Amino acid sequence: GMHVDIELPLGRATALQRLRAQGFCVLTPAALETLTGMPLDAFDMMLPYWEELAPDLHLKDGGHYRYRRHGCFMQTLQPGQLETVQHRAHWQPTTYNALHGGMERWFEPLSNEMIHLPSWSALLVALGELFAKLRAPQGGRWYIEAHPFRIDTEGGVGRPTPEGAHRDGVDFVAVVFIGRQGVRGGETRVFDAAGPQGVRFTLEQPWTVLLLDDQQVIHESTPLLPLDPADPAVPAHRDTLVLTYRSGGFQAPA
Numbered sequence: 500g501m502h503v504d505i506e507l508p509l510g511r512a513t514a515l516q517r518l519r520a521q522g523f524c525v526l527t528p529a530a531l532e533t534l535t536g537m538p539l540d541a542f543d544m545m546l547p548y549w550e551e552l553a554p555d556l557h558l559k560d561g562g563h564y565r566y567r568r569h570g571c572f573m574q575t576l577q578p579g580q581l582e583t584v585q586h587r588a589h590w591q592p593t594t595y596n597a598l599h600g601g602m603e604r605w606f607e608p609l610s611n612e613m614i615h616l617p618s619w620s621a622l623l624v625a626l627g628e629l630f631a632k633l634r635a636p637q638g639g640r641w642y643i644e645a646h647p648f649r650i651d652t653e654g655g656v657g658r659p660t661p662e663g664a665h666r667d668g669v670d671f672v673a674v675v676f677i678g679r680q681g682v683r684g685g686e687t688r689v690f691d692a693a694g695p696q697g698v699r700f701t702l703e704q705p706w707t708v709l710l711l712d713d714q715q716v717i718h719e720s721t722p723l724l725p726l727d728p729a730d731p732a733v734p735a736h737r738d739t740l741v742l743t744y745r746s747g748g749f750q751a752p753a
């Protein structure tokens with residue numbers, strides 16, 4: 500099988516061995532603290548922004564209601580720096596073989612206050628430094644997109660993704676579990692992209708992080724189901740943060 504390190508904290512060197520060997524690993528909240536040098540209280544400062552995400556009104560597929568925001572960055576590895584870049588669209592071609600065309604989506608920008616938190620930079624930088632140890636990006640630069648999400652069961656019906664498991668068309672992905680209430684389901688699955696092996700596990704502790712080598716694994720999560728569907732007024736949602744890292748540039752039409 501494959502290792503789901505969801506109970507014990509991985510150090511950076513073990514996390515690297517895991518990503519090389521199986522193409523993903525899980526960092527417990529304690530492992531994230533150790534990796535980033537930031538205590539969990541500093542990460543908690545980000546939580547109120549998940550109450551202010553913008554509705555994503557682009558799809559009308561009868562799925563659960565989606566809220567999000569979007570922001571992009573460039574990380575330089577030596578000398579280390581992280582900087583914002585101008586707000587930009589997110590590309591969604593029907594295939595990562597696409598050179599041109601496809602859908603470009605404008606979302607609302609991340610809160611400026613959130614991106615100036617110490618934990619925000621600590622998070623993006625530490626993960627970039629880790630990922631560059633597996634596969635160094637061209638010119639020592641990562642192009643990073645951040646997608647904070649809330650999926651709310653107050654409306655819509657959750658169904659399996661038509662496409663099944665996906666990759667993101669980048670080099671590395673981090674899925675950070677931010678929180679959840681009033682729901683079950685939302686189980687993550689990670690599969691070997693070139694073999695039959697897979698794992699299932701449910702992220703439950705805030706600041707648990709799933710690290711993915713986007714060229715070696717594919718992933719998905721199962722639909723949410725309200726714990727108390729009989730009662731509307733009880734909040735029922737799941738919060739995540741998806742960070743993508745890409746060499747060369749942001750995914751974009753030529």
Ligand SMILES: [Cl-]
Nearest residue numbers: 595596668669
């Ligand atoms: Cl690609």
